[PDB]
Amino acid sequence: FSPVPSPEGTKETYWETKAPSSDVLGIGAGVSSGNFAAASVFAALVGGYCTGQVIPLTVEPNPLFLAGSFLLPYSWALHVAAWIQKNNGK
């Protein structure tokens, strides 16, 4: 009804192709599909290892293993970005 504002740098992201344009990756638009795939596996293994090392949680958990455990969900987003980049030819 009036112009709806968006932050500067807003671009069009609507896609009907096989994979979205690399712009949907934000700052990761230039990273290669191999680099996301290797980061995906690396984050999955390190995150799973760190998660496993603190499954019986104590009052003294290792903070590096807590922080490293956040790599498991981050790896999901990494392999999605790897599929997007492989299907954009990157």
Binding site: I27, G28, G30, V31, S32, N35
Partner: protein, 172 residues
């Protein structure tokens, strides 16, 4: 290809004009983040580390009058704990934070592209008016800072293992 690493491709974001360019970015971190931000951060890390490495050696060589009572034996990281209890560390933090607030404004100007990164126009004694000497001095600053970053980590880890401190460990 890259001058540093022959097998890998040349990093796209990095250019020869920028000081301390070896074409070294195998993981391509320069693509992910704005290069101007990375340049400003690298220079800042270099200067803090340079002060840190010189200070680490200096504290072994000599200590300021009256400091010895407050710091009984602790060196490197250990001194910080005692001076944190006393007022030294807090007063340094306060004045550095005040400097950084203006540094935040400077960082914004560098990110916009208006101002060259890492330059605060601080040349109290003229050393870079030649415009040929300036570039050599800039390369010297980058290389010395990189060495000091590596050195600061190297020294502190030796303190962690033995507690000797940089010069004492070399003697024994």
């Amino acid at each position: 290809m890259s001058e540093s690493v022959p097998f890998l491709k040349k990093p796209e974001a990095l250019d020869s004009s920028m000081a301390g360019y070896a074409g070294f970015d195998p993981l391509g971190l320069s693509s992910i983040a704005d290069i101007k931000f990375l340049q400003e951060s690298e220079i800042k890390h270099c200067r803090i580390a340079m002060l840190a490495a010189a200070g680490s050696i200096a504290q072994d060589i000599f200590t300021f009058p009256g400091v010895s009572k407050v710091v009984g034996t602790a060196k490197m990281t250990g001194v910080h704990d005692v001076l944190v209890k006393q007022g030294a560390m807090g007063q340094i933090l306060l004045w550095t934070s005040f400097l950084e607030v203006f540094g935040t404004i400077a960082l914004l100007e560098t990110l916009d592209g208006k101002r060259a990164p890492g330059d605060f126009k601080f040349d109290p004694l003229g050393f870079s008016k030649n415009a040929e000497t300036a570039k050599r001095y800039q390369l010297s600053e980058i290389k010395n800072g990189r060495l000091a970053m590596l050195a600061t980590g190297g020294m502190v880890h030796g303190y962690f293992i033995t507690g000797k401190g940089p010069l004492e460990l070399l003697t024994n």
